[PDB]
Amino acid sequence: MASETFEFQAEITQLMSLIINTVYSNKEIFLREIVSNASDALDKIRYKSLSDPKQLETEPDLFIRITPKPEQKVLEIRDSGIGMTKAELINNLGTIAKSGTKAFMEALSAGADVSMIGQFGVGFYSLFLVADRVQVISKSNDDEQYIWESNAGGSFTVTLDEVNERIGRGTILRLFLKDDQLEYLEEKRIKEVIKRHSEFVAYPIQLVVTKEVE
Amino acid sequence: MASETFEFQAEITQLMSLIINTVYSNKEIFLREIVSNASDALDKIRYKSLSDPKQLETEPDLFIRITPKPEQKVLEIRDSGIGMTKAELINNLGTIAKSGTKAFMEALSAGADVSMIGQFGVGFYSLFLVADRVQVISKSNDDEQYIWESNAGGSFTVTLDEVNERIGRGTILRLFLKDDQLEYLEEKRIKEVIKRHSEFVAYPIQLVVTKEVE
Numbered sequence: 001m002a003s004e005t006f007e008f009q010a011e012i013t014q015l016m017s018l019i020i021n022t023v024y025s026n027k028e029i030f031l032r033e034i035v036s037n038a039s040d041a042l043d044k045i046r047y048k049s050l051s052d053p054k055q056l057e058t059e060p061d062l063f064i065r066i067t068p069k070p071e072q073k074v075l076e077i078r079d080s081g082i083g084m085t086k087a088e089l090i091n092n093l094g095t096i097a098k099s100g101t102k103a104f105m106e107a108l109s110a111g112a113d114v115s116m117i118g119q120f121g122v123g124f125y126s127l128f129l130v131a132d133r134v135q136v137i138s139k140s141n142d143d144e145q146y147i148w149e150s151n152a153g154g155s156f157t158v159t160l161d162e163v164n165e166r167i168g169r170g171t172i173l174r175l176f177l178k179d180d181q182l183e184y185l186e187e188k189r190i191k192e193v194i195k196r197h198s199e200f201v202a203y204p205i206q207l208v209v210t211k212e213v214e
Numbered sequence: 215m216a217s218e219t220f221e222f223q224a225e226i227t228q229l230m231s232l233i234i235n236t237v238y239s240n241k242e243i244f245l246r247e248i249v250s251n252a253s254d255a256l257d258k259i260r261y262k263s264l265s266d267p268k269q270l271e272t273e274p275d276l277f278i279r280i281t282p283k284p285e286q287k288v289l290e291i292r293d294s295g296i297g298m299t300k301a302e303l304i305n306n307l308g309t310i311a312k313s314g315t316k317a318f319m320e321a322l323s324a325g326a327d328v329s330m331i332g333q334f335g336v337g338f339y340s341l342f343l344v345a346d347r348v349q350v351i352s353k354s355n356d357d358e359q360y361i362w363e364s365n366a367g368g369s370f371t372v373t374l375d376e377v378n379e380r381i382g383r384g385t386i387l388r389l390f391l392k393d394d395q396l397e398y399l400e401e402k403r404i405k406e407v408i409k410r411h412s413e414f415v416a417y418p419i420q421l422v423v424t425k426e427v428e
């Protein structure tokens with residue numbers, strides 16, 4: 001099952017650099033950006049559902065779900081939103097321009113808080129504060145399940161998904177956390193970051209916790 | 215990705231019948247049978263590891279993990295034991311004879327408690343007390359990941375797994391619970407059944423719980 005490799009738009013590889021290179025504070029901010037994107041994706045599928053209700057049937061429950069995977073140093077955030085086809089993954093997550101990119105970098109470099117990233121429409125790339133690699137696993141009603149992957153170098157891959165659990169519909173962000181950032185695998189840390197920045201999220205935010213029976 | 219279909223040995227389709235037809239009590243007993251098989255499978259990989267340590271490397275953590283999936287009316291029990299190749303799934307779970315089968319049925323039908331099922335070496339089939347369908351997803355170090363599936367009819371299928379999460383090594387039992395048996399999706403119910411019957415399990419028994427942040 002062969003990967004296809006794509007080059008990032010120039011200003012995205014630029015934006016990526018850094019965000020990872022010039023940040024410093026309010027990085028736990030990566031999580032509000034994630035949840036915000038997930039909420040918007042769920043907004044999209046519910047809106048679409050008003051005129052096309054059967055779009056919901058692939059996954060009738062509307063949720064955002066966070067699953068720490070401490071063994072793998074991974075944090076997953078799943079939504080049952082609209083999902084992205086192969087072409088949408090390629091276009092949304094790296095090959096097309098985003099209007100707000102260069103303006104966010106030129107901004108940042110004059111003291112903008114990075115919380116501002118979302119106002120420019122490039123909030124996805126804030127995950128590189130805590131992660132040195134990401135896979136975005138997505139399933140749209142209009143396509144098969146695919147995996148987009150990036151380690152913040154100049155290329156990304158997209159591969160037909162024959163390896164991950166089936167998502168009925170929606171997207172999983174799979175963050176591979178930096179060795180110094182393992183705190184975001186912690187139940188208390190996660191709830192603390194969520195209550196602060198995602199109060200008026202309209203969807204259930206589920207946390208998956210593993211407990212030894214003893 | 216095509217399924218292969220196999221016929222069950224006669225006395226297994228017989229044993230299946232019923233267990234599901236003549237049971238009545240101590241059915242929560244299905245869980246001790248599961249955990250017992252999982253413990254034995256973990257016993258096997260650790261024993262094998264003494265002379266072949268690198269067998270462990272595909273999944274270094276030794277655990278039993280129970281994951282309720284209430285949306286799907288599913289209960290999963292995962293172990294990181296030795297796992298089963300395609301041929302082992304076909305042989306272990308339905309095509310070869312098991313020495314203790316007929317003796318367990320002839321026994322049962324004179325008032326044996328069904329807790330006895332394990333002493334005859336056929337404890338796997340106790341899952342049909344609570345489940346009307348099962349998939350066994352398995353990954354041995356010696357083969358690809360495969361899915362065995364049965365709904366207690368006379369045939370089962372085995373399919374190369376291109377749909378479920380990767381298990382490094384081991385087996386997941388995926389139980390599709392009967393509509394009247396949804397209690398076994400409940401955190402309290404599960405811990406209660408585990409403490410009673412699996413005290414001297416030597417491995418961590420992990421319970422995966424989903425909690426809304428609120």
Ligand SMILES: C[C@@H]1C[C@H]2O[C@@H]2/C=C\C=C\C(=O)Cc2c(Cl)c(O)cc(O)c2C(=O)O1
Binds near residue numbers: 042092173
């Ligand atoms: C295109 C769809 C629907 C859009 O409404 C969402 C708003 C912003 C999305 C930005 C993205 O780049 C894709 C995306 C990300 Cl990054 C995410 O973390 C979660 C998601 O569910 C989606 C998605 O599926 O986005």
Ligand SMILES: C[C@@H]1C[C@H]2O[C@@H]2/C=C\C=C\C(=O)Cc2c(Cl)c(O)cc(O)c2C(=O)O1
Binds near residue numbers: 258298
């Ligand atoms: C053959 C291997 C190793 C054997 O030591 C285990 C003892 C009994 C197994 C009975 C089976 O039929 C397979 C099996 C079941 Cl049913 C299970 O619920 C969990 C498991 O991990 C295995 C397994 O992988 O079994």
